[PDB]
Amino acid sequence: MRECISIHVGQAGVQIGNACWELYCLEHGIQPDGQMPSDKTIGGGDDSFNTFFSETGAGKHVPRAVFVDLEPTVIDEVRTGTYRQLFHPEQLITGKEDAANNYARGHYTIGKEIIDLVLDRIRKLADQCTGLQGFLVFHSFGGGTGSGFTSLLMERLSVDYGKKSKLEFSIYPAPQVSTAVVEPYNSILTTHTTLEHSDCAFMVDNEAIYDICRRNLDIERPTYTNLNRLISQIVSSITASLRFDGALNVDLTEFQTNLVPYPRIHFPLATYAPVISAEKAYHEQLSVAEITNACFEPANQMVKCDPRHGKYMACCLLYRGDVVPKDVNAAIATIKTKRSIQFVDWCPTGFKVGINYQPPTVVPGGDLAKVQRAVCMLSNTTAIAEAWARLDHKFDLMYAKRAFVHWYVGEGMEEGEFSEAREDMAALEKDYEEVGVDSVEGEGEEEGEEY
Amino acid sequence: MREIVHIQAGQCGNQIGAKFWEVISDEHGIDPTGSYHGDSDLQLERINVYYNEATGNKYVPRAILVDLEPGTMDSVRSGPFGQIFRPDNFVFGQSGAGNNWAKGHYTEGAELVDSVLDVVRKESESCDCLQGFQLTHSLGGGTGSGMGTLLISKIREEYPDRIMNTFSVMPSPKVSDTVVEPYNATLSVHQLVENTDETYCIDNEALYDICFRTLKLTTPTYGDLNHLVSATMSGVTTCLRFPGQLNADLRKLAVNMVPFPRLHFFMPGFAPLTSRGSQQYRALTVPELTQQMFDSKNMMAACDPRHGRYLTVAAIFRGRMSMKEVDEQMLNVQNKNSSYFVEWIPNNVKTAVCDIPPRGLKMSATFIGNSTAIQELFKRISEQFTAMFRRKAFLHWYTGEGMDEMEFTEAESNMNDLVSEYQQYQDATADE
Amino acid sequence: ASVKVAVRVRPFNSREMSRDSKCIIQMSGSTTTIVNPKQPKETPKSFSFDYSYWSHTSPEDINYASQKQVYRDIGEEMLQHAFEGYNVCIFAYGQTGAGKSYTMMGKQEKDQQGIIPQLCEDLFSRINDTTNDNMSYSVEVSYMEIYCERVRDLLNPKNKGNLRVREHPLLGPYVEDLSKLAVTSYNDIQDLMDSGNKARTVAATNMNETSSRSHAVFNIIFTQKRHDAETNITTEKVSKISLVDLAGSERADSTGAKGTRLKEGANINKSLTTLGKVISALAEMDSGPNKNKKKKKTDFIPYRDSVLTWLLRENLGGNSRTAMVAALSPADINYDETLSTLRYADRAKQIRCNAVINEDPNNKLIRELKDEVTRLRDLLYAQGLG
Amino acid sequence: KQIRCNAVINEDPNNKLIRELKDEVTRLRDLLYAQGLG
Numbered sequence A: 001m002r003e004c005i006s007i008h009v010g011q012a013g014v015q016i017g018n019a020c021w022e023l024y025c026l027e028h029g030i031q032p033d034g035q036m037p038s039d040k041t042i043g044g045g046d047d048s049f050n051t052f053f054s055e056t057g058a059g060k061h062v063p064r065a066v067f068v069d070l071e072p073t074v075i076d077e078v079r080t081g082t083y084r085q086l087f088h089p090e091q092l093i094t095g096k097e098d099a100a101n102n103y104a105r106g107h108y109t110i111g112k113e114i115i116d117l118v119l120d121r122i123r124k125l126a127d128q129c130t131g132l133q134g135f136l137v138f139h140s141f142g143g144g145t146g147s148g149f150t151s152l153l154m155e156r157l158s159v160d161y162g163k164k165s166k167l168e169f170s171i172y173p174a175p176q177v178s179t180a181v182v183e184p185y186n187s188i189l190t191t192h193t194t195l196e197h198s199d200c201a202f203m204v205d206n207e208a209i210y211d212i213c214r215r216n217l218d219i220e221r222p223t224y225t226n227l228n229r230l231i232s233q234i235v236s237s238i239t240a241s242l243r244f245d246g247a248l249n250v251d252l253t254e255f256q257t258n259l260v261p262y263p264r265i266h267f268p269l270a271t272y273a274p275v276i277s278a279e280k281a282y283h284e285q286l287s288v289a290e291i292t293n294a295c296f297e298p299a300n301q302m303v304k305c306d307p308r309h310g311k312y313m314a315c316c317l318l319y320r321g322d323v324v325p326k327d328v329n330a331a332i333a334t335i336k337t338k339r340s341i342q343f344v345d346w347c348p349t350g351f352k353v354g355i356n357y358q359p360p361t362v363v364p365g366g367d368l369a370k371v372q373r374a375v376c377m378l379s380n381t382t383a384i385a386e387a388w389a390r391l392d393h394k395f396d397l398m399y400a401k402r403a404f405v406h407w408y409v410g411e412g413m414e415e416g417e418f419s420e421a422r423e424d425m426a427a428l429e430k431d432y433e434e435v436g437v438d439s440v441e442g443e444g445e446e447e448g449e450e451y
Numbered sequence B: 001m002r003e004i005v006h007i008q009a010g011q012c013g014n015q016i017g018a019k020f021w022e023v024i025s026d027e028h029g030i031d032p033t034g035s036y037h038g039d040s041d042l043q044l045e046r047i048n049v050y051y052n053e054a055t056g057n058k059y060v061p062r063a064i065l066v067d068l069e070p071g072t073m074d075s076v077r078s079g080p081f082g083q084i085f086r087p088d089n090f091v092f093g094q095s096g097a098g099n100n101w102a103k104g105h106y107t108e109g110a111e112l113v114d115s116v117l118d119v120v121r122k123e124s125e126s127c128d129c130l131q132g133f134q135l136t137h138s139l140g141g142g143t144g145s146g147m148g149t150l151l152i153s154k155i156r157e158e159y160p161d162r163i164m165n166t167f168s169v170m171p172s173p174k175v176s177d178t179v180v181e182p183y184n185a186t187l188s189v190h191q192l193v194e195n196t197d198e199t200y201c202i203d204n205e206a207l208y209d210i211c212f213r214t215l216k217l218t219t220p221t222y223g224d225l226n227h228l229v230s231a232t233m234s235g236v237t238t239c240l241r242f243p244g245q246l247n248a249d250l251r252k253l254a255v256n257m258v259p260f261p262r263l264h265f266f267m268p269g270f271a272p273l274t275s276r277g278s279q280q281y282r283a284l285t286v287p288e289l290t291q292q293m294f295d296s297k298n299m300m301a302a303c304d305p306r307h308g309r310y311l312t313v314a315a316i317f318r319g320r321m322s323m324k325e326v327d328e329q330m331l332n333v334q335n336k337n338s339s340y341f342v343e344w345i346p347n348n349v350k351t352a353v354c355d356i357p358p359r360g361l362k363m364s365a366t367f368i369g370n371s372t373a374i375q376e377l378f379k380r381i382s383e384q385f386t387a388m389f390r391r392k393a394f395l396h397w398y399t400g401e402g403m404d405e406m407e408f409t410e411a412e413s414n415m416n417d418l419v420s421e422y423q424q425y426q427d428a429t430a431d432e
Numbered sequence C: 001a002s003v004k005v006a007v008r009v010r011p012f013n014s015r016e017m018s019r020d021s022k023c024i025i026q027m028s029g030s031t032t033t034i035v036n037p038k039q040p041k042e043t044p045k046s047f048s049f050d051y052s053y054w055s056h057t058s059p060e061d062i063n064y065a066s067q068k069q070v071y072r073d074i075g076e077e078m079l080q081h082a083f084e085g086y087n088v089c090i091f092a093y094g095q096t097g098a099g100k101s102y103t104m105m106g107k108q109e110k111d112q113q114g115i116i117p118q119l120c121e122d123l124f125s126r127i128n129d130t131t132n133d134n135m136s137y138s139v140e141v142s143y144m145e146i147y148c149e150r151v152r153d154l155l156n157p158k159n160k161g162n163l164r165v166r167e168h169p170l171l172g173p174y175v176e177d178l179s180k181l182a183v184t185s186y187n188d189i190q191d192l193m194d195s196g197n198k199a200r201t202v203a204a205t206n207m208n209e210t211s212s213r214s215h216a217v218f219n220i221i222f223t224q225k226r227h228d229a230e231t232n233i234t235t236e237k238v239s240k241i242s243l244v245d246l247a248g249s250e251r252a253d254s255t256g257a258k259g260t261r262l263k264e265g266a267n268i269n270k271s272l273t274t275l276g277k278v279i280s281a282l283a284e285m286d287s288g289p290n291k292n293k294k295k296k297k298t299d300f301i302p303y304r305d306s307v308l309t310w311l312l313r314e315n316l317g318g319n320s321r322t323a324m325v326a327a328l329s330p331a332d333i334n335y336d337e338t339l340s341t342l343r344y345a346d347r348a349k350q351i352r353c354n355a356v357i358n359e360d361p362n363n364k365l366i367r368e369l370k371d372e373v374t375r376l377r378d379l380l381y382a383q384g385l386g
Numbered sequence D: 001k002q003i004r005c006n007a008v009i010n011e012d013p014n015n016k017l018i019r020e021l022k023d024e025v026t027r028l029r030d031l032l033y034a035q036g037l038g
């Protein structure tokens, strides 16, 4: 049994969880009330997949989910929504104020008195689980709860379970667009925990998704629902390989083994190729070569960073639908001859491939078209440093004058916790600048003995 | 009367073994349930090589299935020939290696190896006179390489006299499917060069080239590649099961092929492979089979034989034919291509002829070469190995499971010594 | 330098005396003459060796080579070289019944002892003899055997498992988890020697009542340290004494082996064939590049074809000073094997070595640079520039 | 009154001595060879 626990923290996490669980219930034919008429109609099967749903005796299916937030609003919207009967009545909601965009409030002051209950529920879920694979933590940098409480939770989970993988999906702040004045402080302070404790951290950006949803899916006024649906498609593409059959099957440990050359550089980008509207679904072959090429297009990246300014260190392609290995090999061969895509000289292979038979589903009322093929590409590259560098500059512009600092120190932190984190951030940046450099010319300087 | 115990490890090994058991059950008229529905009496005469006999007059293959992912076993069971295997031989665990050779060899495989060896002993003690083993696995992966090497080592420790064959799918030159193929390939080859008697090198790119250029298939899948490898595997051990004018046991091939102990890496091939479209044009004769077998395009190893020399070759024909024509054609191939055969092994072409051809073919032949060009393959892996080991590209995953740099260095040294040994015969003009 | 070659002849054995006992070996100075018993008209082909030991006539005193003469010729000099700082090897060779264990091991109860008792003993009586306030010595002893392509530890307590063989990148092949012990007096090492000899696998055969069924290697790691804060260097010297007793060739017709004995004989013959091949290849390789021009293009040497040649890679060539002691049977019936042994001894005489042995390479570089500074300063001062 | 500190590096004495001796050898060799005495 390949089983995962999904943890959703903060407003962004809870809403992405709503989208993700809508997609999962649609995928496995589970009704919003937890019943699955398909098994009754047919007679039986494995459609109650243990990856995401636990089956009780009566035939109901409960998600393997944990929702957490310090406000009651976002989760009260779920307790009385369409899916009110799907979830276990526990939702781990602190009936108090919120972290208030303050990392210290969510990590030190109010993050306590709720971490114990969350850990108890996580332990209860893990006890029922056999052959646990890892965790999927959804949060967002720049928020109070999603930064501080996520940091505390990750630290405690690393202390307790230790060896299990911990995959992290997070919403990095955009370069220009933002919805708060103190985003840089929380984003920089989260570096400690997102570096040491997590195993692989996927970053997505709202500006990139807005750009995609205006060139590809021709929508002019998108909302957060579209962003959450696209992120849900990405996560489903990641997790499909341990729910359905396929020619080449990639588990969660293979991801870490193939995309992480060193422990401190586990920040890959993610992208989805066949993002297209129903009207433009026609006039387009959508072959394997086209989607593979579109994965490498700079315009289709989910984070505002240009891959041409860096070097690719590893790639992982996850195919879904009517995909044959020969076409994948031809597409990879074609990509390897392009000069605009530079790979580090110390990784000659530089490609992981996985194929799954299950095609992507169509959420009713959605925006994506019905397609026969799809591919999700993950790319560990050096361009991500640029996406960090801007943030560091912003942090300096606020820390020189110590603006907004008294709020953070008033909740239990000290000034030094800022500077230390910044120093740590600098180290990470330098590490990237160390790894993207070409090996020195004739790395043994020069050689040649007698004969 | 001789047996062969069969072991399968990993996804690639499991699928190739499934197709192989489907090809063998056809040749012998075993039905997807174990019942015999053949027509020729010779099918049952030597069925003891692969199949045990059950109490209900059914036949059960002497196969062992190994993996650390239950998905492969589930796929095998839910298939046309899933029920034929006995369920007790399905040995597996959970939390697969994940393309980590260390997990397959040291951490996880160390627990399942005892169960696999118990089943191997149970199958081996029931044979009248065991001949040898054969293993299908992929070098570039996880559980395949590690568990295959560990099982090979354990069996050679326990059964030193018996034969150990291996049909290994090596990493391709430019086609790749996992990032860390060179590490696993280098370690697996370091293990194989010591503890095996024969090793048939198979390459995915060569099979794709055969499918595209020779058979003219537009959308080849893994099934076709398994088909080819399975036809090669049957063709190797034909003489154990059917009569012939001049038989050739496995030991005969082992003796006549390898000149020295460390050179047992064989390039295989099969003929006749046409196009379903030009079957009506090409006449089937011994010269045509000889022409197709020695063609560089028809090899399954993706190494050009014209870049080296043949230390030894073996041709096993199946079908009614004349020995005069076969011997004349082998002598002709030697004489015309005088530059591609070593000068110090006179008449280095083993010949075998079996009377019974495959199902619906009048004649067939399989080719087993041992050429220095195989060195190219190792060199490629070695090159890529250096390109990652110099910077320690992914080394923490391997050192976390209980290994060190010394193992990598000694494996690389063994690879380089093997390459040098093949090189030292490659050039002509042994004097100076 | 080159391989040192010693040849020694043994007296008759009961089986040889029972059958035809006409001797064919003659030996004078540093020359050995063999006469074909089937072709008396043929020339008495002769061979030259660095050392020659006629031990055929026991009670006489006319060119009789006792055990101590053989030691004083070979083992003395080998220890002296070991003190000088070189790794040293002495390995026996011959056919079954030649008398290799007699030359190496000897009889404990008698005064006539083989090479190793003499050396381990002399070295103790020299360390103990020269110990001082500044000087100090350390000795560690190991003893392994190769039975059927598997390494077993002789001094270790009962452990039926087989030890793994690794390849250190600088130090070459070695054995993992070998029970290397420390000895401080002669009684301890004598106890280790007796335990190892008792632990060795020995079986009776028609050619020898107590034939050897396994190759054996006796290893002494020897360390010299100097203690003075002003002038001396600690751990200044480390060296290895390797003493190898090989199992001889066999022929199943005269041997009379059946079952396990036949398998042991086959494995022994396989390993010895590999050893002969590597010896011949080494000889040709060193001779050619020495004489032919100096090309040094490429010459593969099959070290890896057997575990015996793999473990002894550094002794057969490279970083060691090595001696080969061939034993020869006198009888006419064993002529075909004796001639082969002589031929391979002659081939081994052509092999070369390259041994320096330096310790702590940072200290090597430091002392070399200091000597260079002194030399250049003296040159400048002599020329008026310093 | 934040002021610049830079990085304090604890060098290995072995490498320090090796580098110093290499510099001395280089200077002496350059002086000797420049005058044609080597």
Ligand SMILES: CC(=O)O[C@H]1C(=O)[C@@]2(C)[C@H]([C@H](OC(=O)c3ccccc3)[C@]3(O)C[C@H](OC(=O)[C@H](O)[C@@H](NC(=O)c4ccccc4)c4ccccc4)C(C)=C1C3(C)C)[C@]1(OC(C)=O)CO[C@@H]1C[C@@H]2O
Binding pocket: B022, B023, B026, B027, B215, B224, B225, B227, B228, B231, B234, B235, B272, B273, B274, B275, B276, B279, B358, B359, B360, B361, B364
């Ligand atoms: C005209 C005719 O009779 O059809 C042939 C045919 O056209 C050809 C093209 C067949 C055909 O093979 C293929 O098309 C093919 C495609 C991909 C991979 C492998 C094969 C054939 O399928 C293959 C099939 O061969 C057999 O049945 C053999 O006994 C073969 N066994 C199987 O193919 C087999 C597969 C699944 C289950 C049971 C048996 C075999 C060969 C050697 C040793 C043992 C078994 C045959 C004669 C043919 C068809 C049907 C078209 C060829 O295959 C073989 C090995 O016979 C391809 O080159 C040969 C030459 C044949 O002429």
Ligand SMILES: Nc1nc2c(ncn2[C@@H]2O[C@H](COP(=O)(O)OP(=O)(O)OP(=O)(O)O)[C@@H](O)[C@H]2O)c(=O)[nH]1
Binding pocket: A009, A010, A011, A012, A013, A015, A016, A070, A098, A099, A100, A101, A102, A139, A140, A141, A142, A143, A144, A145, A146, A171, A178, A179, A180, A206, A224, A225, A227, A228
């Ligand atoms: N993509 C996406 N991002 C969201 C969504 N909702 C919130 N965000 C991001 O979240 C950031 C605001 O911080 P939050 O994560 O909401 O903080 P919080 O979880 O509410 O915790 P508190 O600060 O204590 O209220 C914004 O900058 C958004 O970019 C969403 O539905 N989709």
Ligand SMILES: Nc1ncnc2c1ncn2[C@@H]1O[C@H](COP(=O)(O)OP(=O)(O)NP(=O)(O)O)[C@@H](O)[C@H]1O
Binding pocket: C009, C010, C011, C013, C055, C095, C096, C097, C098, C099, C100, C101, C102, C103, C208, C210, C211, C212, C213, C246, C247, C248, C249
């Ligand atoms: N020079 C010698 N003088 C007296 N007895 C000897 C002499 N050399 C050997 N022997 C005896 O003859 C026998 C053969 O000696 P041994 O050294 O055991 O041969 P070996 O080397 O062991 N043959 P192998 O089985 O290949 O090891 C033993 O009984 C010895 O005691």
Ligand SMILES: Nc1nc2c(ncn2[C@@H]2O[C@H](COP(=O)(O)OP(=O)(O)O)[C@@H](O)[C@H]2O)c(=O)[nH]1
Binding pocket: B009, B010, B011, B012, B013, B015, B016, B099, B138, B140, B141, B142, B143, B144, B145, B169, B176, B177, B178, B204, B222, B223, B225, B226
């Ligand atoms: N010939 C062949 N190769 C395969 C097949 N399936 C996978 N492979 C190869 O196996 C490699 C991946 O190794 P994998 O099978 O996952 O190793 P495992 O996880 O230990 O079983 C890839 O390079 C593929 O080319 C198959 O059906 N046939």
Ligand SMILES: [Mg+2]
Binding pocket: A010, A011, A071, A098, A145
């Ligand atoms: Mg909030």
Ligand SMILES: [Mg+2]
Binding pocket: C100, C101, C211, C212, C246, C247
């Ligand atoms: Mg002996």
